[PDB]
Design a protein around this motif. Structure first.
Motif, short mmCIF file in Angstrom:
data_model
loop_
_atom_site.label_atom_id
_atom_site.label_comp_id
_atom_site.label_asym_id
_atom_site.label_seq_id
_atom_site.Cartn_x
_atom_site.Cartn_y
_atom_site.Cartn_z
N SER A 1 36.93 41.46 41.22
CA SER A 1 37.60 41.17 42.09
C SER A 1 39.00 40.53 42.22
N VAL B 1 31.76 42.67 36.55
CA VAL B 1 31.55 43.81 36.63
C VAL B 1 31.89 43.50 38.23
N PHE B 2 31.78 43.04 39.11
CA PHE B 2 32.70 42.36 40.40
C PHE B 2 33.86 43.18 40.40
N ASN C 1 32.08 37.34 34.31
CA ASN C 1 31.90 37.66 35.54
C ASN C 1 33.31 39.13 35.61
N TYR D 1 26.91 29.53 39.26
CA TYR D 1 27.23 30.87 39.85
C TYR D 1 27.47 32.29 38.55
N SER E 1 26.68 40.33 45.99
CA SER E 1 27.67 40.21 45.81
C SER E 1 28.56 39.85 46.37
N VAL E 2 28.34 37.75 47.37
CA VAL E 2 29.27 37.92 48.66
C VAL E 2 29.24 36.46 47.56
N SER E 3 29.09 35.87 46.71
CA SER E 3 29.66 34.96 46.22
C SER E 3 31.49 34.52 45.56
N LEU E 4 32.08 36.23 45.61
CA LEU E 4 33.50 36.33 45.09
C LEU E 4 34.26 34.84 45.93
N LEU F 1 25.00 35.28 38.92
CA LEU F 1 25.55 36.46 38.87
C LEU F 1 25.01 37.92 38.54
N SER F 2 24.57 37.26 36.84
CA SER F 2 23.90 38.52 36.35
C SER F 2 22.32 38.72 37.00
#
Length: 107
Positions: A94, A91-92, A89, A45, A51-54, A49-50
């Protein structure tokens, strides 16, 4: 019992998490090879990624922490892998994933 935990993990990977977590912890080799699936999932994941997978990552981290808490050289390797996958991760940004990762690293 080997396959019984699979259903519980799948159900918990979806406010009721406390009940399933407590049941799994009180229920109790296979864990050594079982954690590899979660590790590979997080790595895949993060790479994709490199946005709903959080939410999925947060759920996986929570179930991983619960299974490890339900219970000596691979500890450092797994800790470093988790730290790298979490820091990747960036960027997002979260809060749920960060909190779950912090709890996992702490335990």
């Amino acid at each position: 019992f080997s396959t019984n935990f699979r259903d519980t993990v799948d159900i918990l990977v979806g406010s009721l998490t406390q009940q399933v977590s407590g049941w799994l912890q009180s229920l109790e080799a296979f864990s050594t090879t079982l954690l590899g699936q979660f590790l590979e999932d997080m790595e895949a994941y993060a790479e994709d990624l490199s946005s709903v997978s959080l939410p999925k990552l947060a759920a996986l981290l929570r179930v991983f922490s619960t299974v490890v808490r339900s219970i000596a050289y691979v500890t450092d390797v797994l800790y470093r892998v988790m730290r790298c996958v979490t820091a990747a991760n960036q960027v997002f940004f979260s809060e749920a994933v960060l909190t779950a990762a912090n709890e996992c690293v702490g335990v």
